[PDB]
């Protein structure tokens, strides 16, 4: 929210670099459960946490795709069988 909060100033590049490096692990976390079906979590900084067979859980970002990742990871867990 600090990014949309100020962009028209000269402090925009420094904050842009800081957000660019602060989103580096989370994108890999997202990159895991889709492309390997490996739900990875370290300290609970990932937004969505963990017969009927699944006991995975759920909960700024687009909420249109936030539920979509929760269903996209479990689909990979189905194809492994």
């Amino acid at each position: 929210q600090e990014a949309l909060h100020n962009c028209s100033n000269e402090h925009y590049p420094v904050l842009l670099s800081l957000l660019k490096t602060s989103c580096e692990p989370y994108t890999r976390f997202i990159h895991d459960w889709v492309y390997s079906g490996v739900f990875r979590d370290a300290y609970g900084e990932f937004m969505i946490q963990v017969k009927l067979y699944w006991t995975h859980g759920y909960v700024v970002f687009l909420k249109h795709i936030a539920h979509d990742i929760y269903v996209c990871g479990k689909t990979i867990n189905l194809l492994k069988l």
């Binding site: 600090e2 909060h5 100020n6 962009c7 028209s8 100033n9 000269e10």
Partner: protein
């Protein structure tokens, strides 16, 4: 008396020039070795340093005190910070002139203060003109895009240094609105 005027005028005033917020800078003025001749030149020179301190104080006061966030446009807003941003870049040649004087004083310090007033005479006109432009914005608590008009009527000017100085700052204030326009449109 040569170096000390630079130390006062730079915005880091000494104890010879006791800064008040109701008189600005004032020399100590209680000597049997101070003459009326120095007095008038000093009093002319005092205005410029008082203006510079008020300018830098304004810029510091409204830039670097919040991230970007009262909702009142006279105290807060992106247009005002863009104004401060233009003002410091306008303030740059004053600093250049002060350093320029300093080098020649290190070469030979026996140069007169009249030459300093003679050099600094061009900013002596420019500073009071822009002073009222910032003072109106602070006084009337002007919100948003109306701030753009307030400089604008004063940037159709009839003196080249004043008009050219305000015009660039108005370009900065244009740019921030353009950036928001690049989203909403």
């Amino acid at each position: 008396m040569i170096h000390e005027l630079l130390l006062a005028l730079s915005g880091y005033p000494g104890s010879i020039f006791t800064w008040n917020k109701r008189s600005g800078l004032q020399v100590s003025q209680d000597f049997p070795f101070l003459h009326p001749s120095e007095t008038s030149v000093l009093n002319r020179l005092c205005r410029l340093g008082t203006d510079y301190i008020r300018f830098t104080e304004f810029i510091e006061q409204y830039t670097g005190h919040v991230q970007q966030q009262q909702g009142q446009g006279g105290l807060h807003g992106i247009y005002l910070r863009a104004f401060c941003t233009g003002l410091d870049s306008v303030l740059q040649p004053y600093r250049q002139a002060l350093l320029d004087l300093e080098q020649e004083f290190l070469g030979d310090p026996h140069l007169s203060i009249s030459h300093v007033n003679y050099f600094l005479d061009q900013f002596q006109l420019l500073f009071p003109s822009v002073m009222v432009v910032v003072e109106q914005i602070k006084s009337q608590k002007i919100h948003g895009c109306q701030i753009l008009e307030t400089v604008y009527k004063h940037s159709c000017g009839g003196l080249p240094p004043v008009r050219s100085a305000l015009e660039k700052i108005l370009a900065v204030c244009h740019g921030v609105m353009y950036k928001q326009l690049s989203a909403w449109m």
